């Protein structure tokens, strides 16, 4: 189908004969400097090769505030998600329009070149409530609150260079090369598969019903740019993504990885998705259950309904002008042994089955055995092999403040006592200094899967600088993980419930 | 590299709007046509898409000597393969200089327009000796007396398209496509493997090997058009290289089928698929041990030195303008577990080991166990697979013409005798009438695997249409393969000598 807009807006095609001028620009002395944050260097790259069509640089405040209030540009094109450059007051104040500002990534390889058209401050609470939903634990509110900037920076581009990336170069396809690849297939029929987590048996099923139900060739388009936090990394998912491919017929399927940066902005995500999917050359889109949503807040309510966003793309489907290809909840069959879409079976003449994400985390973090019918083994492997069961995973004892026994003395018989286990894991005690450069090489270890003893807390004001993850806090205080009976309880006896707790929470198994 | 000859005769690409018109000329009922044969449509197809560069048609007398006697083209570019258009009496007496003949596939698909520049008799004995050494028995000289036409026409082509293919649409990269493969990659240097067998341990070794001599990203560049008598069949072998492939670390090997029909020429061939490799975008090609060789003749001596084809391209090194990467025996090290060139060890210092070709077809007829260092176990599955066997595989026997026994209850008693043992095998007592319909349908079912009765033999006049594989004559002769006592002897007896003669040949297992 015709690119959103009509033109596909490869602006690495359209600036080629400007490279070497827009370089040398670029890296003169006088030019201001921006440097791209991480979510930006995914943005601009979907804006610079078409797959935002028809964008061609950041939304000013004319389209942003259309896009808002409206899931529209300005000019009344449909587009449901923001697409903006936040810059922080210092910088912003650096600037008018008319002013030309060269895009970094790494404060080392220029991007491209933006031309200012307007700085605005954005009323962050309407975005989040009239784009998102409001909820502020919902994912790009806390992002757009926590990590945006606070001014917006409209303006078009002129293409350097996609971002850079060392991983997979064959497979990030730009929407020129994925259109040929499907070409020299012959494919005029495609449909696109969306996805941020490891596909199981049900997404296996699911694609290939679709690819049977819209007579179509499967594109199994992951994202790899950026997804909901605690997501399993793309690295991994690459490595499942590979593996699951070859479970589908020779020649019927095809991968390619989309930089994209998600908002998990469900229903309105959606539409978007489909948009861009039509822009990479998709003739078709699927569009399951709770797509894009982030599931369920700390209260336990939906941030969006399981099928707003199915919804929401049939109120628009006579001008998407890709084919959406709708899903209900794909379950499993005990006894018939497959999976099948729910709103074609229960009548309770039939039990079915689901492993829900929860569920997954759980065994993969209690060494649980990942039925057969669920996922493929080789998926689970690659799965397990990333996300290791307690028994391999790395935790730190924090020495509370409260401690009255020797702080040496008490990391010793830590040391010595977890040695005796075994186990492959690594020990060591571990001080901190308040200093920031160590303190953030804890995760790196309990990443490691390494055991850190910590003699001493580190002051409230770097908590922050260290993750949460496997941190135990050993103390009196009714905070503690571990708690114990007195400041000055005998180190056996400290040893003794230090032991049992982690052996508890599975990270000793005898 | 440059494409041999400077220009890339991409001929879909430089015809493209002639592509109608030329469509319009195949399908007019006045113009004579030619259907191509098997290994016309693997030349037709590399000569339209650049892979023969600068080949744009069929030799004529003039070019077609030059190589013969020059291993160069009348022009002086180097060229050591003839590539021609054979046909027969009768069709080369319709045709005259200027005249134009549309080309199809499959007496249905029009490939392209040949203008003629001539039609010569070529004296096939100079061609055979000069070119493919003499032997009676090589693959290119047995082709060419008892296959190829006895007369040639040389043209230039005008394409319409490259022959049809459904298998592996995505794999058989052109030269054009596979140059871009390697630039949206940002490989320079590649360095290609040329292949016609599964690749192994050794293989796998190898290529690494000359990735890192070279210090080119691997390219590997298998035969699917048409190679040597009984080799394993390209489906197999494309199972084959898509698992081994990923025995390589991620994102250095490529993989692409090439629709080329081998001549199974030794050292010329090997200048040939340099020449070849290079249009394709290669910057190094590999070159082993008797490369493109045929092996021994049934004397037992060679057809080429195992060295000849690096000695020849060594020769040619200075204007193939692609580096050749050469290799000498490549063998098995048991006390240090690792493969390494020959020419770099020995000194009976160290022991060797080596599973040749031979040896590998035996086991996979015997059921034996493969080596896990000689070959990897997935390899080994999908080759057993394609290659059951005996006790999986299929078989006939004839009543020889000399029994005199009912040939109908000595049918029946077999039949009933062989079902008994079960095992999976399907059985049928087959009556051919001498109809070669019937005749020709006799290896499908061996192929398929079932065991064939045939109560009488058929006239000589037609024991070509039938396969001589795994077919058994039960008759008094010599020349039988189980040989009767007398013409009339007992069935019971007669039953018991095919039994125990299928059970001795591993048919059966008890
Ligand atoms: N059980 C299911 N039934 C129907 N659709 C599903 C199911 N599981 C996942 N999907 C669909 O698969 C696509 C991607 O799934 P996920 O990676 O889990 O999440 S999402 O954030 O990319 O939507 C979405 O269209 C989603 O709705
Ligand atoms: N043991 C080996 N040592 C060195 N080179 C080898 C070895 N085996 C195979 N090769 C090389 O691998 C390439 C393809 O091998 P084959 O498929 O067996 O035959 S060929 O007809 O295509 O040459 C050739 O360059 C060949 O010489
Ligand atoms: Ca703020
Ligand atoms: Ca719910
Ligand atoms: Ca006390
Ligand atoms: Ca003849
Ligand atoms: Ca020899
Ligand atoms: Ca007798
Ligand atoms: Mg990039
Ligand atoms: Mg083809
Ligand atoms: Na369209
Ligand atoms: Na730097
Ligand atoms: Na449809
Ligand atoms: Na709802
Ligand atoms: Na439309
Ligand atoms: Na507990
Ligand atoms: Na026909
Ligand atoms: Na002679
Ligand atoms: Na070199
Ligand atoms: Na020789
Ligand atoms: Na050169
Ligand atoms: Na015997």
Same mark, same amino acid.
């Given at each position: 189908?015709?690119?959103?807009?009509?033109?596909?807006?490869?602006?690495?095609?359209?600036?080629?004969? +400007?490279?070497?001028?827009?370089?040398?620009?670029?890296?003169?002395?006088?030019?201001?400097?921006?440097?791209?944050?991480?979510?930006?260097?995914? $943005?601009?790259?979907?804006?610079?090769?078409?797959?935002?069509?028809?964008?061609?640089?950041?939304?000013?405040?004319?389209?942003?505030?259309?896009?808002?209030?409206?899931?529209?540009?300005?000019?009344?094109?449909?587009?449901?998600?923001?697409?903006?450059? $936040?810059?922080?007051?210092?910088?912003?104040?650096?600037?008018?329009?008319?002013?030309?500002?060269?895009?970094?990534?790494?404060?080392?390889?220029?991007?491209?070149?933006?031309?200012?058209?307007?700085?605005?401050?954005?009323?962050?609470?309407?975005?989040?409530?009239?784009?998102?939903?409001?909820?502020?634990?919902?994912?790009?509110?806390?992002?757009?609150?926590?990590?945006?900037?606070?001014?917006?920076?409209?303006?078009?581009?002129?293409?350097?260079?996609?971002?850079?990336?060392?991983?997979?170069?064959?497979?990030? +396809?730009?929407?020129? &090369?994925?259109?040929?690849?499907?070409?020299?297939?012959?494919? $005029?029929?495609?449909?696109?598969?969306?996805?941020?987590?490891?596909?199981?048996?049900?997404?296996?099923?699911?694609?290939?019903?679709?690819?049977?139900?819209?007579?179509? +060739?499967?594109?199994?388009?992951?994202?790899?740019?950026?997804?909901?936090?605690?997501?399993?990394?793309?690295?991994?998912?690459?490595?499942?993504?590979?593996?699951?491919?070859?479970?589908?017929?020779?020649?019927?399927?095809?991968?390619?990885?989309?930089?994209?940066?998600?908002?998990?902005?469900?229903?309105?995500?959606?539409?978007?998705?489909?948009?861009?999917?039509?822009?990479?050359?998709?003739?078709?889109?699927?569009?399951?259950?709770?797509?894009?949503?982030?599931? +369920?807040?700390?209260?336990?309510?939906?941030?969006?309904?399981?099928?707003?966003?199915?919804?929401?793309?049939?109120?628009?489907?006579?001008?998407?002008?890709?084919?959406?290809?709708?899903?209900?909840?794909?379950?499993?069959?005990?006894?018939?042994?497959?999976?099948?879409?729910? $709103?074609?079976?229960?009548?309770?003449?039939?039990?079915?089955?689901?492993?829900?994400?929860?569920?997954?985390?759980?065994?993969?973090?209690?060494?649980?055995?990942?039925?057969?019918?669920?996922?493929?083994?080789?998926?689970?492997?690659?799965?397990?092999?990333?996300?290791?069961?307690?028994?391999? &995973?790395?935790?730190?004892?924090?020495?509370?403040?409260?401690?009255?026994?020797?702080?040496?003395?008490?990391?010793?018989?830590?040391?010595?006592?977890?040695?005796?286990?075994?186990?492959?894991?690594?020990?060591?005690?571990?001080?901190?200094?308040?200093?920031?450069?160590?303190?953030?090489?804890?995760?790196?270890?309990?990443?490691?899967?390494?055991?850190?003893?910590?003699?001493?807390?580190?002051?409230?004001?770097?908590?922050?600088?260290?993750?949460?993850?496997?941190?135990?806090?050993?103390?009196?205080?009714?905070?503690?993980?571990?708690?114990?009976?007195?400041?000055?309880?005998?180190?056996?006896?400290?040893?003794?419930?230090?032991?049992?707790?982690?052996?508890?929470?599975?990270?000793?198994?005898?």
């Amino acid at each position: 189908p015709a690119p959103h807009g009509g033109i596909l807006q490869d602006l690495i095609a359209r600036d080629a004969l +400007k490279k070497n001028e827009l370089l040398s620009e670029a890296q003169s002395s006088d030019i201001l400097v921006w440097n791209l944050t991480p979510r930006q260097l995914c $943005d601009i790259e979907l804006i610079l090769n078409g797959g935002f069509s028809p964008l061609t640089g950041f939304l000013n405040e004319n389209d942003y505030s259309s896009v808002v209030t409206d899931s529209r540009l300005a000019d009344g094109t449909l587009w449901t998600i923001p697409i903006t450059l $936040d810059v922080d007051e210092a910088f912003a104040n650096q600037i008018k329009p008319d002013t030309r500002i060269a895009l970094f990534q790494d404060d080392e390889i220029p991007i491209a070149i933006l031309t200012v058209q307007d700085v605005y401050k954005p009323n962050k609470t309407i975005e989040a409530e009239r784009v998102f939903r409001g909820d502020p634990e919902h994912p790009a509110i806390s992002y757009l609150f926590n990590v945006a900037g606070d001014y917006y920076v409209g303006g078009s581009l002129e293409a350097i260079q996609l971002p850079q990336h060392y991983d997979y170069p064959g497979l990030r +396809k730009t929407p020129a &090369q994925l259109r040929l690849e499907f070409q020299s297939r012959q494919w $005029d029929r495609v449909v696109a598969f969306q996805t941020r987590n490891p596909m199981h048996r049900a997404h296996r099923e699911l694609t290939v019903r679709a690819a049977r139900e819209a007579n179509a +060739k499967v594109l199994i388009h992951p994202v790899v740019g950026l997804t909901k936090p605690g997501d399993i990394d793309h690295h991994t998912r690459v490595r499942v993504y590979q593996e699951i491919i070859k479970r589908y017929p020779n020649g019927i399927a095809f991968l390619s990885l989309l930089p994209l940066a998600m908002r998990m902005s469900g229903d309105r995500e959606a539409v978007w998705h489909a948009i861009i999917r039509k822009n990479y050359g998709a003739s078709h889109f699927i569009v399951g259950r709770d797509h894009a949503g982030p599931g +369920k807040n700390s209260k336990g309510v939906d941030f969006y309904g399981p099928y707003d966003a199915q919804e929401l793309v049939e109120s628009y489907k006579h001008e998407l002008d890709i084919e959406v290809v709708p899903f209900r909840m794909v379950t499993y069959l005990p006894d018939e042994d497959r999976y099948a879409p729910i $709103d074609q079976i229960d009548t309770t003449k039939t039990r079915t089955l689901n492993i829900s994400g929860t569920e997954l985390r759980r065994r993969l973090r209690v060494g649980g055995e990942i039925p057969e019918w669920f996922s493929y083994p080789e998926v689970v492997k690659i799965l397990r092999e990333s996300n290791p069961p307690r028994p391999k &995973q790395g935790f730190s004892i924090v020495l509370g403040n409260s401690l009255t026994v020797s702080r040496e003395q008490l990391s010793i018989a830590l040391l010595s006592t977890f040695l005796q286990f075994g186990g492959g894991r690594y020990y060591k005690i571990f001080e901190h200094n308040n200093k920031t450069e160590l303190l953030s090489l804890i995760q790196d270890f309990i990443g490691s899967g390494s055991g850190l003893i910590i003699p001493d807390q580190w002051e409230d004001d770097k908590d922050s600088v260290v993750g949460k993850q496997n941190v135990y806090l050993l103390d009196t205080s009714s905070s503690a993980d571990i708690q114990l009976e007195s400041a000055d309880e005998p180190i056996s006896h400290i040893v003794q419930k230090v032991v049992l707790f982690l052996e508890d929470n599975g990270f000793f198994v005898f």
